[PDB]
Amino acid sequence: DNNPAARLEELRTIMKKNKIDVYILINSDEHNSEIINEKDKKIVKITNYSGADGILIVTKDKPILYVNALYELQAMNELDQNLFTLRISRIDNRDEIFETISSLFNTIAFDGKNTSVVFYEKLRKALLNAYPKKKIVEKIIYNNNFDDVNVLNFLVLEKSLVEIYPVNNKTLYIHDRKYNGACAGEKIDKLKQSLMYDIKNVDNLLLSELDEIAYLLNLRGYDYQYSPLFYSYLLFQFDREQDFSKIVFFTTVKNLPADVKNLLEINKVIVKEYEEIVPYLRDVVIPSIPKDFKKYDISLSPYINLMIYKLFDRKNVLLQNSPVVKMKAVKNDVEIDNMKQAHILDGLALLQFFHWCEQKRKTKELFNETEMSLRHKVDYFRSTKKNFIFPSFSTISASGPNAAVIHYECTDKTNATIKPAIYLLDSGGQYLHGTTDVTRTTHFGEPTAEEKRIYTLVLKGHLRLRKVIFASYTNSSALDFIARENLFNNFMDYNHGTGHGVGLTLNVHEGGCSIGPVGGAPLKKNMVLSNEPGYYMKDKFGVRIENMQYVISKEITDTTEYLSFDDLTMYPYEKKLLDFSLLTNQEIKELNEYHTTIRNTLLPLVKQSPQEYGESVEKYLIEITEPIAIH
Amino acid sequence: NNPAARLEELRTIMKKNKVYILINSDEHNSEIINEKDKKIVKITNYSGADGILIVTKDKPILYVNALYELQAMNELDQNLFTLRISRIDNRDEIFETIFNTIAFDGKNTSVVFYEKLRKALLNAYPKIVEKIIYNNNFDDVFLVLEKSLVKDYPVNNKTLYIHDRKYNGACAGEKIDKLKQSLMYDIKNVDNLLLSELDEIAYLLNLRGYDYQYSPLFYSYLLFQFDRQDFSKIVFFTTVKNLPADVKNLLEINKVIVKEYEEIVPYLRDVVIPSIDFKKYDISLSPYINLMIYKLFDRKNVLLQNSPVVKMKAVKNDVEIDNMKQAHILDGLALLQFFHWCEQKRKTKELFNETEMSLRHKVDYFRSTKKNFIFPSFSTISASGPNAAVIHYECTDKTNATIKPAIYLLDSGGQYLHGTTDVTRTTHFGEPTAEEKRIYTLVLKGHLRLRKVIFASYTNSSALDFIARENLFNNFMDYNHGTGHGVGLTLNVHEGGCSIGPVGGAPLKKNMVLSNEPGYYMKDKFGVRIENMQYVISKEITDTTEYLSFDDLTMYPYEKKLLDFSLLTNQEIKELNEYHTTIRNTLLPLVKQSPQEYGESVEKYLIEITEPIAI
Ligand SMILES: [Mn+2]
Ligand SMILES: [Mn+2]
Ligand SMILES: [Mn+2]
Ligand SMILES: [Mn+2]
């Protein structure tokens, strides 16, 4: 069974020989991607725990695995605890892991490319606070040579101790201006302006965030499954006396085509290889810098990997968001229009999927289908659509009790038969037009009063956030609250955020803005956000209703600008799940307004392609967009 | 009191000394400052509380908060001084707006304004040298002045007194012990703490004083010296002639050494400072501490942060809450007497011979009748008609208006041994227009929502500010102030540690005491504000979550004449009746037990305004 006990007892033989007392493994890559590829998944190889979130502490004792609360169920069914100790990290338990390591040994090791500076600094500060009489020495270990080292040794490893897959040779391609509305040259010019005015204390900026590099250069790639990104670093050297000294692009050159180097060399970009980043920083750059108002040597993203961080002296590094974060959080008008087209396509795909579900429901063949079968079906209907690339994340297809698991990951052994019950579908896709994220909840059986109540309580928060009018200064955490409001009155909550930013053909989860309880800021026009309240009833069912929307200016008076949202997502809601004792007439009016707009948008497109859809499809569309009676 | 004369006279004293910056503030950063600290008004004849005066060779520039703009416009002469306004988005304009040797009042300037100004001017003029000027000797050379360039006026000899445990529920020793633990665990990088906030010192020592009009505070400093594991020395700087016999008993009981007030700077420079990657700080100072004390230390060694006392007093213990309920019971009775009085004169038309100030005096009187009353907690706002549209409206001798059959707004409160009250009610002495009724009800809807709102404990207080605005937002209307502020116990009516507002925000904790006061102000016509005080309670605890809500402190009804029933939900009607009935159940037995202070006419009036709405 790819024996865990074996690979673990094997692991401590490699540690002992290098005189390493405690090893720390984390699920991460060097670019801090949410979804990491196979080469970077070490923890699963040892523990047979495939959950995305995890941190493994490996000592002479039984190893400890830390996972987020949302992954607790998955870890319980996967990990066997006679080998590993399972600990859970909750909202109040977060720094436990930092305490835990402190409470145990003289030499600790880290994967240099798999460890963020945030986790490193907090652990190290914990140890200063834990053992003040001990001094810490930090060394980078190159090519597995440990022979160069009272004291606590922090070892940052170039090569990982766990060695590991398929490789991507597919070529990079240009994202056309018609889709992104802004050329790579203007964006670089914008980054240039930022260095003149906004950040004056650094001449050197390193972009390690893959969606930032792709966005700035208008390039996409195949190095990741769910995002059209590519392994890269992009280094800017600014000369105050007022432009860029050097622009260096680290990436995989064999994946660089002819006419990409045309756009690249036009902007005066020097191309190096991907693995050249560390030696280039260590050898050419850091020695080239000269030694009241402080001036920093380098500006790094907050989550930059440990290996690149440790090349410098901490006093000279500035950890902050790249200017690209703000740049890309606000879409231009071409970008919004393109995001509308993508959602039109995605509405058609959902229409085909639920039409398909409805037919098989009537024929009852639907209940021989599985979660994976339905997951594959919606992904298929998207692939038929124009300018589609691939799904924007792993589709969540959950029937009955599985819908109560937010992070539910359908395995080959977890796959469930579709039942006449609640069905939750969270899915999206990557288009040249943009990135989509949408959730709909439906019912293939006869909905209970509880199910309709929960759905409607969730819907009310969702509908509120759709049309909410708020002064421009309003903190986005206030918008998170009104989505929870109706659940709060019933003493119910959901354990995730209400909305996340979404990139344009980049990442389905994008920073720069959000709607959530912890942290928040005013929203700006043409920010693109999800709206997805939910509620999850353990062992019974779960509900989530998700749209994407963008911020508009609603009205401007003498003293104040009022903002609101406009819809991106076009698909109707589930009438079978509606509780009308909870619904106001205004909400019903907004429901009818939305559904009518959907019919007006989708129906002509359905009709012009009778071979692709047909009368049964358009008839289904008409019925679910039909106005609800007010009386 | 010629401004031009005093301005050109001001220019005789600076020129000999080779931009002067005047601010309305005192050394303890109090909202309300005494006569000794108002310099700007002497030059500009601008009596507004908030202001900063930039004095250069050109025409001087005065910066005031937006709420003081109306007052500043008719008072200030604008051909002499340039008037600029500070709103929510122009906050740093003045620093941009802000030359060679520049001067500041050392005791009237906070380090926040000082450091932000210096960092900004550096940000492009890449070098600055800073010197302290003692006793007006400038010949040794940013200039920080010990003595101001701009003081005959009165002094308080009234005695300090002890705040009994029965009111505050915790002894001074217990609070110090809490402050002690804080230094053990929470703050390990500094051994020295200086309390410059008068309400923090008053709270900790359970002492009150007469040095301020609207708050029972006293000029003081309190310095703590921590030794790795207790306080080595605790020194209390204050005015000893105002220190009575048995207060110095409570002081020496806590092993506090009493020095005088003016010894603060000499004791710091001479006695303490000559002592003492992972950094250790010499001193911890409150963010708004004056420059004079700040410049005794090097910036690198100065840790600027909220004292632990801020968190301590922002959360009331149960005795403190119970006392504050008693305070509001008394203040409900006072309001009852006042509006009953207004109603009587309304029927006879005698009300419209009354003025705003006369009504202001009347409500303050009815408070003075109540047990354990000390004085008003702030200047009572009494505004009729168009004046109600002014948020900051200060009734003057020349602004005093005859009471009219129109909107009337009353914002008032008092200091009790039991606590500090703040309450606003808006009523109508005429026949309310549909517009007036609509605006009142839109404000009320936000107010009522904030009363009973259920929120998970992590909810940012800015979310609560929003739901108070939302019904106004839908009509594209807003109010230019915050929704709520913290309130001290027999302390400042505006207290930090928490708030409900659009900009800053944090989760709320149980037994925090906050105002709830949405409003709307229609220029030149009328204005409405509805204010309660309430405290945070635990509503429900589930497996995964704690839900919080508020419980009422303020007991007084709302105005039925101003209700727009097209805007009111049945839930809102139900809550109104629940509140009004509760008020009757609370107040009526007390009204009945004192017929000579509260007549039969009063009991009937109370019953009428607490009567259920037909829904
Ligand atoms: Mn989704
Ligand atoms: Mn989403
Ligand atoms: Mn107030
Ligand atoms: Mn008030």
Q: Which of B80, B32, B76 is nearest to B60 (CA)?
A: B80
B301 contacts: CB under 8 Å, gap ≥ 6: B281, B282, B283
> Do B484 and B515 touch, CB atoms closer than 8 A?
yes
Phi and psi at residue B134, to the nearest 5°? -95, 140
d(CA B222, CA A323): 45
- Spacing, Cα B237 to ligand 1 middle (Å): 61
> How big is the CA angle at A267 (ends A264 and A268), to the nearest 5 degrees?
90
d(CA A491, CA A617): 40
Taking the Cβ of residue A480 and every Cβ of chain B, the question of whether any pair is shorter than 8 Å is answered with: yes
How, if at all, do strands B103-105 and B373-376 pair?
unpaired
d(CA A487, CA A536): 11
Per DSSP, the three-state class of B469 is: helix
Q: Which of B570, B528, B576, B579 is nearest to B552 (CA)?
A: B579
How, if at all, do strands B82-86 and B61-65 pair?
parallel
> Do B183 and B459 touch, CB atoms closer than 8 A?
no
A201 contacts: CB under 8 Å, gap ≥ 6: A293, A294, A295, A296, A318
A488/B455 CB distance under 8 A: yes
- Spacing, Cα A546 to ligand 1 middle (Å): 6
d(CA B199, CA A592): 56
B502/A128 CB distance under 8 A: no
d(CA A176, CA B205): 70
> How big is the CA angle at A135 (ends A132 and A137), to the nearest 5 degrees?
145
Q: Where are the beta strands (DSSP E) in B444-512?
A: 455-456, 484-486, 495-500
d(CA A254, CA A276): 14
Taking the Cβ of residue A562 and every Cβ of chain B, the question of whether any pair is shorter than 8 Å is answered with: yes
Token digits of residue B216: 């029972």
- Torsion sign (Cα): A338, A339, A342, A344: negative
Q: Measured between alpha carbons, how far is residue A5 from residues A53, A109, A487 in Å?
A: 21, 21, 45
Long-range contacts of A280-284, Cβ-Cβ distance < 8 Å, separation of 24 or more: A280/A235, A280/A248, A280/A250, A281/A206, A281/A235, A281/A308, A281/A311, A282/A311
d(CA B256, CA B249): 10
Q: Which amino acid is at A265?
A: E
CA B548 vs. chain centroid, Å, equals 25
Token digits of residue A200: 């004056």
d(CA B186, CA B199): 22
- Spacing, Cα B421 to ligand 4 middle (Å): 8
End-to-end CA distance of chain B: 60
Token digits of residue B232: 């080595």
3-state class percentages of chain B: helix first, strand second, coil last, to nearest 5: 40, 20, 40
How, if at all, do strands B283-285 and B257-260 pair?
unpaired
> How big is the CA angle at B505 (ends B503 and B511), to the nearest 5 degrees?
140
Q: Which of A334, A560, A569, A551 is nearest to A435 (CA)?
A: A569
- Residue A440, number of CB atoms within 10 A of its CB: 21
Residue B9, CB half-sphere, CA atoms under 13 Å: how many? 11
A624 contacts: CB under 8 Å, gap ≥ 6: A572, A575, A595
Token digits of residue A134: 């001990």
H or E stretch including B44? helix B40-44
Query: What dihedral do alpha carbons A136, A141, A147, A148 form, nearest 10°?
Result: -60
d(CA B613, CA B585): 16
Q: Which of A177, A172, A255 is nearest to A220 (CA)?
A: A172
d(CA A173, CA B578): 67
Q: Where are the beta strands (DSSP E) in B211-328?
A: 220-227, 230-238, 257-260, 283-285, 302-304
A128 Cα to chain B: minimum distance (Å): 9
Which ligand places an atom closest to the C-alpha of B381?
4
Phi and psi at residue B425, to the nearest 5°? -130, 140
Which among B456, B476, B540 has the least Cβ separation from residue A555? B476
d(CA B82, CA B65): 14
> Do B553 and B328 touch, CB atoms closer than 8 A?
yes
A200/B123 CB distance under 8 A: yes
B71 Cα to chain A: minimum distance (Å): 19
Q: Which amino acid is at B26?
A: D
A-chain residues near B505 (CB < 8 A)? 475, 477
- Residue B129, number of CB atoms within 10 A of its CB: 8
A514 Cα to chain B: minimum distance (Å): 15
- Residue B5, number of CB atoms within 10 A of its CB: 10
Burial of A337 (0-12, 13-18, 19+ CB in 10 A): middle
Query: What dihedral do alpha carbons A91, A95, A96, A98 form, nearest 10°?
Result: 160
H or E stretch including B513? strand B513-516
Q: Which amino acid is at A67?
A: V
Give chain B's domains with CATH numbers. Answer: 3-145 (3.40.350.10), 161-314 (3.40.350.10), 318-610 (3.90.230.10)
Burial of A565 (0-12, 13-18, 19+ CB in 10 A): buried
Burial of A319 (0-12, 13-18, 19+ CB in 10 A): middle
A556 contacts: CB under 8 Å, gap ≥ 6: A562
Q: Which amino acid is at A156?
A: V
A292/B127 CB distance under 8 A: yes
Q: Any idea what DSSP says for residue A612?
A: T
H or E stretch including A607? helix A585-607
**Largest Cα–Cα distance of chain B, in whole Å?**
79
Given in angstroms, what resolution was this structure solved at? 2.3
Taking the Cβ of residue B547 and every Cβ of chain A, the question of whether any pair is shorter than 8 Å is answered with: yes
d(CA B372, CA B329): 12
Token digits of residue B48: 């507004």
B-chain residues near A562 (CB < 8 A)? 473, 476
B166 contacts: CB under 8 Å, gap ≥ 6: B319, B323
B residues 591-610 near A, CB within 8 Å? none
Taking the Cβ of residue B518 and every Cβ of chain A, the question of whether any pair is shorter than 8 Å is answered with: no
Q: HEC states along A367-405?
A: HHCEHHHHHHHHHHHHHCCCCEEEECCCCEEEEHHHHHC
d(CA B34, CA B46): 15
Per DSSP, the three-state class of A618 is: helix
d(CA B64, CA B23): 10
Burial of B270 (0-12, 13-18, 19+ CB in 10 A): exposed
Residue of A nearest to B121 (CA): A293
B residues 119-138 near A, CB within 8 Å? 122-123, 126-127
B-chain residues near A533 (CB < 8 A)? none
Chain breaks in chain A (C to N over 2.5 A) after: 104, 149, 164, 241, 291
Which among A292, A468, A478 has the least Cβ separation from residue B463? A478
Q: Measured between alpha carbons, how far is residue A349 from residues A315, A381, A397, B108 in Å?
A: 52, 5, 15, 67
A327 contacts: CB under 8 Å, gap ≥ 6: A187, A190, A191, A215
d(CA A516, CA A500): 8
> Do A216 and A234 touch, CB atoms closer than 8 A?
yes
H or E stretch including B132? strand B131-133
> Do A67 and A45 touch, CB atoms closer than 8 A?
no
d(CA A164, CA A36): 14
Q: DSSP secondary structure string, B350-361?
A: GGGG-BHHHHHH
Residue of B nearest to A478 (CA): B463
Looking up tokens 């050249």 gives: A276
d(CA A25, CA A67): 12
Residues belonging to chain A: 631
d(CA B207, CA B221): 13
Token digits of residue B204: 């900790």
Residue B453, CB half-sphere, CA atoms under 13 Å: how many? 27
B-chain residues near A559 (CB < 8 A)? 478, 480
> Do B424 and B339 touch, CB atoms closer than 8 A?
no
- Spacing, Cα B500 to ligand 4 middle (Å): 14
Q: Measured between alpha carbons, how far is residue A205 from residues A208, A253, A267, A269 in Å?
A: 10, 22, 17, 15
B473/A562 CB distance under 8 A: yes
- Residue A266, number of CB atoms within 10 A of its CB: 10
**Residue B541, beta-bridge partner list:** B546
d(CA B316, CA B498): 12
Helix and strand numbers, DSSP H then E, in chain B: 18, 29
Taking the Cβ of residue A258 and every Cβ of chain B, the question of whether any pair is shorter than 8 Å is answered with: no
A residues 460-479 near B, CB within 8 Å? 468-471, 473-475, 477-479
CA B511 vs. chain centroid, Å, equals 19
3-state class percentages of chain A: helix first, strand second, coil last, to nearest 5: 40, 25, 40
d(CA A176, CA B593): 84
Q: HEC states along B118-186?
A: HHHHHHCCCCCCCEEECCCCCCCCCEEECCCCCCCCCCCCCCCEECCHHHHCCCHHHHHHHHHHHHHHC
Burial of B271 (0-12, 13-18, 19+ CB in 10 A): middle
Q: Which of B118, B119, B146 is nearest to B132 (CA)?
A: B146
- A-B contacts (CB, under 8 Å): 90
Q: Any idea what DSSP says for residue B309?
A: H
B-chain residues near A555 (CB < 8 A)? 476
How, if at all, do strands B103-105 and B143-145 pair?
parallel
Neighbours of ion ligand 4 (CB under 5 A): B 411, 422, 424, 531
What angle, rounded to 10 degrees, do the helices at A585-607 and A449-467 form? 80
d(CA B583, CA B532): 13
Phi and psi at residue A390, to the nearest 5°? -165, 175
H or E stretch including B64? strand B61-65
A484/B456 CB distance under 8 A: yes
User: What is chain A's alpha carbon radius of gyration, rounded to the nearest angstrom?
Assistant: 26
- Residue A273, number of CB atoms within 10 A of its CB: 12
CA A257 vs. chain centroid, Å, equals 28
Question: Which ranges constitute the DSSP H helices of A218-370?
Answer: 260-266, 277-279, 306-309, 323-329, 333-362
Q: Which of A150, A62, A56, A147 is nearest to A106 (CA)?
A: A150
Q: Where are the beta strands (DSSP E) in B327-422?
A: 373-376, 381-384, 407-412, 414-416, 419-420
> How big is the CA angle at B424 (ends B418 and B427), to the nearest 5 degrees?
135
- Sheet holding A243-251: strands in order across? A270-273, A243-251, A232-239, A204-207, A298-300, A317-319
Question: Which ranges constitute the DSSP H helices of A145-255?
Answer: 177-180, 184-197, 210-217
Which ligand places an atom closest to the C-alpha of B529?
4
d(CA A380, CA A418): 18
- Residue B377, number of CB atoms within 10 A of its CB: 28
Q: Which amino acid is at B278?
A: F
**Residue A108, beta-bridge partner list:** A22, A154
H or E stretch including A192? helix A184-197
B residues 75-94 near A, CB within 8 Å? 88-89
> Do A26 and A54 touch, CB atoms closer than 8 A?
yes
Q: HEC states along A454-493?
A: HHHHHHHHHHHHHHCCEECCCEHHHHHHHHHHHHHCCCCC
Looking up tokens 């002014």 gives: B390
d(CA A370, CA A353): 14
A-chain residues near B540 (CB < 8 A)? 491
Taking the Cβ of residue B184 and every Cβ of chain A, the question of whether any pair is shorter than 8 Å is answered with: no
Per DSSP, the three-state class of B475 is: coil
d(CA A537, CA A541): 5
> Do A360 and A344 touch, CB atoms closer than 8 A?
no
Residues belonging to chain B: 615
B49 Cα to chain A: minimum distance (Å): 23
How, if at all, do strands A561-567 and B407-412 pair?
unpaired
- Residue B581, number of CB atoms within 10 A of its CB: 14
Taking the Cβ of residue A481 and every Cβ of chain B, the question of whether any pair is shorter than 8 Å is answered with: yes
Residue B95, CB half-sphere, CA atoms under 13 Å: how many? 16
This entry's atomic model was obtained through: X-ray
Phi and psi at residue A521, to the nearest 5°? -150, 170
> Do A323 and A304 touch, CB atoms closer than 8 A?
no
A475/B460 CB distance under 8 A: yes
